[PDB]
């Protein structure tokens, strides 16, 4: 099966999202000031009616909790970034898993 790509489709999909560090106030990052990062959102499994209270109670116990499949990245990519470190030096560093390439259900 293929990963799905969306914009502004109800199944687990990859949506666009651009991170802007300069707008975030993080000027210690020289480059990239902006990059396509993206995210995963959407439906996974048919939800049995009997499962609803479980899903509902889990959310009330912890909104970050998961009691079933998760729509989440299945492929991610790094980015090479240029930034000031803590010793007044500038570093080119490969930061892993910065870009969402594909989404899928766990």
């Amino acid at each position, epitope marked *: 099966d293929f990963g799905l790509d969306c914009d502004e489709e109800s199944r687990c999909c990859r949506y666009p999202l651009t991170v802007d560090f300069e707008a975030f106030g993080w*000027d*210690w990052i*020289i480059a990239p000031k902006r990059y396509k990062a993206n995210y995963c959102s959407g439906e996974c499994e048919f939800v049995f009616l009997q499962k609803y209270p479980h899903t509902h109670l889990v959310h009330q116990a912890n909104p970050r909790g998961s009691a079933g499949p998760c729509c989440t990245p299945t492929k991610m990519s790094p980015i090479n970034m240029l930034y000031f470190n803590g010793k*007044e030096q*500038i570093i*080119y560093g490969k930061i892993p898993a910065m870009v969402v390439d594909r989404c899928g259900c766990s």
Partner: antibody, heavy 116, light 108 residues
């Protein structure tokens, strides 16, 4: 049109001080990191200083660290280079440039000569 | 400090020919290399960064490659206006350092 215009260069005695200015226009100055780079009489390129877009972070090579200070005034769209304890080897054409991964839209330069 | 070496200080080419300029880093610099073009009486202009990325508005004939220590700048088909000194630079770790430059002349 992106334009960087350096000024303030001239003849200064060794041990002396000089302040260079760089007038920026044609882009959002406050969103760009900026750098100074110099070209020696032998045509050798040397990185001098870098400053973050907001001005809090700076970096320098050891050759000028403690003698040179890079600063900026975002409200005045101006980049500065305060030089002190000037040495003969600081003689060069000084360029200001926008800083991304590399230096771009370098100005036409201001000449600094250090001699008695 | 990292040393950038351009072994060819001078290169002679004809219009329409392929030109390749080499740059060697004294240490692994990943893909953190930029290439600049300097024409007489002008300041250097950025062509490539991160070894292969063309800066905005740079012609398609200019490409870059390499990773680690060996880097190559290529002009696919030399135009008369390409008469310039080409410099490499590492943007891997401060202090940033430049190659000594390669002057490209036009044969006649």
């Amino acid at each position: 049109e992106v334009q960087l215009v350096e000024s303030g260069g001239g003849l200064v005695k060794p041990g002396g001080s000089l302040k260079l200015s760089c007038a920026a226009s044609g882009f959002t100055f406050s969103s760009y990191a900026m750098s100074w780079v110099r070209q020696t009489p032998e045509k050798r390129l040397e990185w001098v200083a870098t400053i973050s877009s907001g001005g809090s972070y700076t970096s320098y090579p050891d050759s000028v660290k403690g003698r040179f200070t890079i600063s900026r005034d975002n409200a005045k769209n101006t980049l500065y280079l305060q030089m002190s304890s000037l040495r003969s080897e600081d003689t060069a054409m000084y360029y200001c440039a926008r800083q991304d991964y590399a230096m771009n839209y370098w100005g036409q330069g201001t000449l600094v000569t250090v001699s008695s | 400090d990292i040393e950038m070496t351009q072994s060819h200080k001078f290169m002679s080419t004809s219009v329409g020919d392929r030109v390749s300029i080499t740059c060697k880093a004294s240490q692994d610099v990943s893909t953190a290399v930029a290439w600049y073009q300097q024409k007489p009486g002008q300041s250097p202009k950025l062509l490539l960064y991160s070894a292969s990325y063309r800066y905005t508005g740079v012609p398609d004939r200019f490409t870059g490659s390499g990773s680690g220590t060996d880097f190559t700048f290529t002009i696919s088909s030399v135009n008369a206006e390409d008469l310039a000194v080409y410099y490499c630079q590492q943007h891997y770790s401060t202090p940033w350092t430049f190659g000594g430059g390669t002057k490209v002349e036009i044969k006649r």
